[PDB]
Each structure stands twice: as structure tokens, then as C-alpha cells.
Amino acid sequence: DRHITIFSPEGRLYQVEYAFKATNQTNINSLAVRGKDCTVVISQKKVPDKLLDPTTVSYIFCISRTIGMVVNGPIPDARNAALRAKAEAAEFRYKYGYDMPCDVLAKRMANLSQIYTQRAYMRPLGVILTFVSVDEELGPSIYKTDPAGYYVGYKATATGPKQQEITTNLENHFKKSKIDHINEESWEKVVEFAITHMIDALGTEFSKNDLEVGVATKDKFFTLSAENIEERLVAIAEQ
């Protein structure tokens, strides 16, 4: 029972629980927040090996024109999920004539995860997927998928070892603001907010190399270069 996705006498799926443990292997924290018409993802980048090419080290994926995905968990399973999600989104657009919604993609990937929880021959992927978009109907959207095949929408979310500290700080901010979103008109200020909040939660300053940032807008999802992150960090230093 410990080795395959069958029930224990307690009705537990131990391999699913252990796949959750794998999601923290990378020791990386990610944060997502909604603006009025953008969604921002912040992820830590840890590149201690000087021989790495840092531009290749990313846990943020462009799934479609409109959907970004950030992964917590080991990069091979992350790239598996990313490739599958890309294929699903292109196939959806082909079958149905419109861009796959972020919530629909999250549902589909969660159902694949459920299959891995139910069929013994496939292990779970050890990854948590956070999808972000500005939906044509739902507006800015965060949907997060996990190894159980659970998914839900979020006002904001964090993932990783310190997700409780970031989450409680976000919750306190929403208690302070009485809103379901960050009240700012342009994504640069949402990025600056999200970075400032990650700093306050983790207690660490960031260089432009210590972060990666994804922004979903109505037109596209895109990832910031290190120099755009520099511009945001100096803005925080000066604002």
C-alpha cells in the first residue's frame, strides 16, 4: 500500500502524500497575485553553481499566448506537465475554435493527476502547478493544481516551504484592504507589490538574479528579463 496508489486501511494514498513532499525538493517559493487586469507570478531563482547558464534555469513556463504556468517541484516533472499543458491548449484551440481558459486547463491537468492517483502503473508527478491568465470571461485568474488532482481558483497564492508565511501575510493584506485583488491599474506596480511582499515574508532582499517574474495581461503572458526585474527592484528602492 505504501508503494502504489491503493488505499491504506485509513483510506490514505501514501504515494500521493509523498509526491507532495517531492514538491518541496527544490526549496523554492513562488507567489501569485491578481491585479485589476493582470496576474503576476513571482518565483525565487536559486543558481548557486557558477557554471550554470542562468537563462536556462526557469520554473515559469509559457503554456499559450495567454496562459502562464509556474511549477513547484523537480524540473523534469515540471517540463512533463508543461509539454502536456501546451499540447492540451493547442488541441483545445483546434477542436473548439477558441483559446483554452486557464481554469479549463487546470481542470484537465488535475484530471490527469487523478488518473495517476487511481491507476497503479503511473506514479504521480511530484509537482504543484499554478496556472495564471487574464481570462476573456473571468478576468485575471489563478488556478493551482496538485498531485491529488485537486484544483481551485485563488485570489492569491504562494507555494513552497515558506508558503504559510507568504500566505498569512497576503491574508493580512486582504484583511487590511478588504478587496479580492491588488488595486493597481498597471502590472509594474503589482510586480513591485509582489516582490516587496515576498521580501517581507522571507526576510531576504533579492538581486535581479534571485527572482523570475511572470506577468499575464489580456494580450499575452510574458516573463520579465533580469533587467526588467532590476527596474522593478530599483523602483521599490526609490518608491
Binding site: 513532499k21 557558477k50 550554470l52 547558464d53 536556462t56 523537480p74 523534469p76 512533463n80 502503473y121 504521480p124
Partner: protein, 244 residues
């Protein structure tokens, strides 16, 4: 974790796939392979152990080309590396058939990573007992990758695998510090020879043959070519004098 290590794709309670860690132990037993990214290309080198006088010199080639523009070198279970390269060649041919351009190196890297990661999904398959250093020149220039048994890969400025990986990695670190402007392809060939020789100050139980390859826009027109003759002997001379 003696309970959870008998079967691939089982998570341990701490979330580990122990069969992949054991495949990594298979890699660490392999001979030293390195890669160096130069200002317009990549250099690959490998320690080939001379297990006896009876092996034909220069003949047991370990570096493999993929398409015409990708070099691959690997440490560990050499047959698993050949198997991975056969898949890579299939993937490259398929890409060029559908898209007439040569496969971009990052695309090829992901194709390999997915194939290796798939060998971690099921208990009916073994992980790859190789770590593979590969790269080449494409329209966006030079790329160097190292792929692990997990399917994890990253881009590198320089990479090392096998028994001598730690000394090679320290020498590549120094090389990257001292040449921030980027190394030239010929100098990278000389340095690769030196680094393999220094890594063979471990594992000295036997003699070894150096094999070098490169892919450079200036020196090879972006085609993967073996380093042979004069330049190989010059590299060996440089490595020996840098020691002696």
C-alpha cells in the same frame, strides 16, 4: 530507504526516487566527460581508459554526433548513452522532416529530457545509467547542456560528468573566472585536454586516450567535427606541459 528502493517510480516518504539516485551512482563510476562553451561553439572531451594494450588506438570512439550539428558525450553505462543518442537522432530527423530546419539545441535537449524522465515514470523500466553532456551550434549560437538520469537538464558554461567530475568542475570554474570575455574554440580545445588530464590524476589505475570534438561557427562552419591530427597532438602537448 531500504523499503522504497526496489522499484522505479516509487516515492519514498521523503519524496525521493532511490532508483534514480542509484543510476546516479552508476554515472559517478563512469569515466570523466566534459564540455566547454566557447565564444562561438562547444568543445567536448572524454577520458577513454586503455584497459589493455590490445584496444586499437583511436578506434573505440565514444563521442557521438547527432544530425550534423550536435555533439553528445556521456559518462556511465555507455550502452544507455548509445540508446539515448539513437532516440536523439530519431527526434532530430523527425524535427527536420516536419520543420526543414535543423533541430534547435534547446528543443533537442527537451526531447531527450522527456525521454529520460519517462524512464522514471514506471517500474517496468530502468532509469538511464548515463549523464549526457551535449550541445552544438544553432541559429541562436552555441548551447551546452548536461542531462541527468532524472531527466533534469540545464544549460551550462562548462560541464563535467564521471569519476573526475569534481576536479574538472573546479578547473572549469577557474577557466570561467579567468576568461570572462569567452574562450576561443582552439583555446577551449587546449583547456579541455588539460582538464581531462588533470581529472586523470584521479582514476590513475590505468592509462587513457584523450578524445576531443568540437562544433564552431568559425572553425567548423557550425558542424560537429572530431579534433584530429595536429590540433589534437598540440592539445595533448599543452596538457602534458601544463602538468610537467
Amino acid at each position: 530507504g531500504t523499503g522504497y528502493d526496489l522499484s522505479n517510480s516509487v516515492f519514498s516518504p521523503d519524496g525521493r526516487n532511490f532508483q534514480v539516485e542509484y543510476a546516479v551512482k552508476a554515472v559517478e563510476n563512469g569515466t570523466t566527460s566534459i564540455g566547454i562553451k566557447c565564444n562561438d561553439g562547444v568543445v567536448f572531451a572524454v577520458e577513454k581508459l586503455i584497459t589493455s594494450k590490445l584496444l586499437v588506438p583511436q578506434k573505440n570512439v565514444k563521442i557521438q554526433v547527432v544530425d550534423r550539428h550536435i555533439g553528445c558525450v556521456y559518462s556511465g553505462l555507455i550502452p544507455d548513452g548509445r540508446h539515448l543518442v539513437n532516440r536523439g537522432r530519431e527526434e532530430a530527423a523527425s524535427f527536420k522532416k516536419l520543420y526543414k530546419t535543423p533541430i534547435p539545441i534547446p528543443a533537442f535537449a527537451d526531447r531527450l529530457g522527456q525521454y529520460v524522465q519517462a524512464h522514471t515514470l514506471y517500474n517496468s523500466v530502468r532509469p538511464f545509467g548515463v549523464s549526457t553532456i551535449f550541445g552544438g551550434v544553432d541559429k541562436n549560437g552555441a548551447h551546452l547542456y548536461m542531462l541527468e538520469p532524472s531527466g533534469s537538464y540545464w544549460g551550462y558554461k562548462g560541464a563535467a560528468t564521471g569519476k573526475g567530475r569534481q576536479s574538472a568542475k573546479a578547473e572549469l570554474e577557474k577557466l570561467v573566472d579567468h576568461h570572462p570575455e569567452g574562450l576561443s574554440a582552439r583555446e577551449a580545445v587546449k583547456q579541455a585536454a588539460k582538464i581531462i588530464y588533470l581529472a586523470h590524476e584521479d582514476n590513475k589505475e590505468k592509462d587513457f586516450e584523450l578524445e576531443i570534438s568540437w562544433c564552431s561557427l568559425s572553425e567548423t562552419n557550425g558542424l560537429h567535427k572530431f579534433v584530429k591530427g595536429d590540433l589534437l597532438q598540440e592539445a595533448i602537448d599543452f596538457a602534458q606541459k601544463e602538468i610537467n
